[PDB]
Design a protein around this ligand. Structure first.
Ligand SMILES: *[C@@H]1O[C@H](CO)[C@@H](O[C@@H]2O[C@H](CO)[C@@H](O)[C@H](O)[C@H]2NC(C)=O)[C@H](O)[C@H]1NC(C)=O
Ligand SMILES: *[C@@H]1O[C@H](CO)[C@@H](O)[C@H](O)[C@H]1NC(C)=O
Lengths: 98, 49, 165, 246
């Protein structure tokens, strides 16, 4: 008795249930009018599936910065809840939001 | 019949020790590889070994 | 301006990203991950019938042997992939450098020339004659091997002894 | 105005539920979980309208045999005040609504029927965290449990004959729903609809030996800590024992 033999795997399979019940990011990014800074809005988002890729349709061009997280590995994480604060400021006060 | 039973029993025991933490984080080894860093993984692997 | 705040509180995580799934392949030795259940083997069609809330099946030894596919709600049997011992049979280097190989406990069709299927396993490199002799090199389940005429490794059935009446 | 009166009765080996989601075939399996012990003393309540709250600890077994439309749901909480979160469940002929909020519950709540109004159950709602909507003689049994921030409900409906409630026999409760609420539960109450009797028992840590048939259904069980005879069956891992000393 000299050797041992085992066949090796050749492929990888991952199976998960269907994707549905998407989070309402479209309502926040596209609406009638954004709130007024002193009186801003806070929306609580929970119990849904969030895909941070459809964002680019609603024009996040001028600025996109992410503290504490990574813009790519966002949908790879799970959180208890997420908030969305939206308002309107002048084009020169954006630097103050940090 | 007795002889046969004895042999069978032994085999089952040898299987059941596989699904045991043995004082480690978990019995599954691949999870210990995935979650943990090489410094702390070695002691767990040695413990299971 | 939109500001997003991510919170990890002490509660079950109910906001996650999408989890993509690949296709389903059968009759192959593959690694699989069914809804968090990770393993490897061969997936075949099952005849079992789970209850509507049950997701996978375990054996008497507490090993997973069946699984339900999350998208199409069918049952699949999980089977371990082939493994075994490899033994080498020789006439002795004083006689020849030819050898035969035994694969213990596998079919000759499972990814292993004269090939022969026995009860012990798959035998490669030997010729299976009929007429019997005394056992020379035991193989198992009544099969023995020898070096006979030109000269080659042959396999045969064990012969108990001369008939008398 | 509702008045409640208590009496006592016997469990008779009821309250068994599937603890896992694993299919098993013709196997005896030993588990350790929160169960209702065999032959225990459970409380029988008679509510009449011509009601203090109940404690919640390590889960509750609830049973009823009313001809429906009288009992509608339950209230779960820890203070039943505006300063703590509370869970509310109401059933109608069409749907089931589960909500966790910061309620200001009234003493002796009930549903008013004239349209079904909820101005006699609470006064304010305040912050609401989780909401869920789904689908809605005879004996109906429920098991309520709360572990690691998950609220689990098991249920079963059984057509019963004779005139005895909680009859003799075996029936296992399938999982009904699991809710990720992550709140604290210490007390609970029952809701009535006005234009009732029920059974309450408490769960305890316990080890059981369950029997699965070839179709994957639980058919019988053994409680280890009941009798010396039932402990031998669990050391031997078998439902029959032969003559001797163990
Ligand atoms: C997940 O989505 C797939 C389609 O992408 C569903 O498969 C279809 O299901 C419908 C159900 O009405 C059938 O009529 C189709 O014939 C199916 N098509 C295929 C290609 O399978 C699947 O049912 C969804 N998952 C669940 C659990 O419903
Ligand atoms: C045994 O003899 C038969 C002839 O009847 C032959 O067909 C068979 O191959 C023989 N077995 C061997 C050679 O192992």
């Amino acid at each position: 008795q000299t050797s041992n033999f085992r066949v090796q795997p050749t492929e990888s399979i991952v199976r998960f249930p269907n994707i549905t019940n998407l989070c309402p990011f479209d309502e926040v990014f596209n609406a009638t009018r954004f709130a007024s800074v002193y009186a801003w809005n806070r929306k609580r988002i929970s119990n849904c599936v969030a895909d941070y890729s459809v964002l680019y349709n609603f024009a996040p061009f001028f600025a996109f910065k992410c503290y504490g997280v990574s813009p790519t590995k966002l949908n790879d994480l799970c959180f208890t809840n997420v908030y969305a604060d939206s308002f309107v400021i002048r084009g020169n006060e954006v630097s103050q939001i940090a | 019949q007795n002889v046969v039973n004895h042999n069978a029993q032994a085999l089952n025991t040898l299987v059941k020790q596989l699904s045991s933490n043995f004082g480690a984080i978990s019995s599954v080894l691949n999870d210990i590889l995935s979650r943990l860093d090489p410094p702390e993984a070695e002691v767990q692997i040695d413990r299971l070994i | 301006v939109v500001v997003l705040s991510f919170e990890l509180l002490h509660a079950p995580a109910t906001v996650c990203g999408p989890k993509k799934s690949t296709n389903l392949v059968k009759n192959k030795c593959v690694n699989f991950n069914f809804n968090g259940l990770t393993g490897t083997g061969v997936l075949t069609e099952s005849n079992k019938k789970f209850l509507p809330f049950q997701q996978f099946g375990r054996d008497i030894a507490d090993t997973t042997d069946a699984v339900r596919d999350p998208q199409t709600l069918e049952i699949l049997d999980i089977t371990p992939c082939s493994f075994g011992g490899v033994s080498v049979i020789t006439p002795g280097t004083n006689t020849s450098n030819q050898v035969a190989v035994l694969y213990q406990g596998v079919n000759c069709t499972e990814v292993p020339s004269n090939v022969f299927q026995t009860r012990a396993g798959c035998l490669i490199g030997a010729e299976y004659v009929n007429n019997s002799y005394e056992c020379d090199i035991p193989i198992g389940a009544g099969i023995c091997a020898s070096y006979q005429t030109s000269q080659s490794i042959i396999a045969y059935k064990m012969h108990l002894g001369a008939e008398n009446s | 105005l509702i008045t409640r009166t208590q009496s006592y009765t016997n469990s008779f080996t009821r309250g068994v539920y599937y603890p896992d989601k694993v299919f098993r075939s013709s196997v005896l399996h030993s588990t350790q979980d929160l169960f209702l012990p065999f032959f225990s003393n459970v409380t029988w309540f008679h509510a009449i309208h011509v009601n203090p709250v109940l404690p919640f600890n390590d889960g509750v077994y609830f049973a009823s045999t009313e001809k429906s439309n009288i009992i509608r749901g339950w209230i779960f909480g820890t203070t039943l005040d505006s300063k703590t979160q509370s869970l509310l469940i109401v059933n109608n002929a069409t749907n089931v609504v589960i909500k966790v909020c910061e309620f200001q519950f009234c003493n002796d709540p009930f549903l008013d029927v004239y349209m079904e109004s909820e101005f006699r159950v609470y006064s304010s709602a305040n912050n609401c965290t989780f909401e869920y909507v789904s689908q809605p003689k005879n004996l109906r049994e429920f098991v309520f449990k709360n572990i690691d921030g998950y609220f689990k409900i098991y249920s079963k409906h059984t057509p019963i004959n004779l005139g005895r409630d909680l009859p003799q026999g075996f029936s296992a409760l399938e999982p009904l729903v699991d809710l990720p609420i992550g709140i604290n539960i210490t007390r609970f109450q029952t809701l009535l609809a006005l234009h009732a009797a029920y059974y309450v028992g408490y769960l305890q840590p316990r080890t059981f030996l369950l029997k699965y048939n070839e179709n994957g259904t639980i058919t019988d069980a053994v409680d280890c800590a009941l009798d010396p005879l039932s402990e031998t069956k669990c050391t031997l891992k078998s439902f029959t024992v032969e003559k001797g000393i163990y």
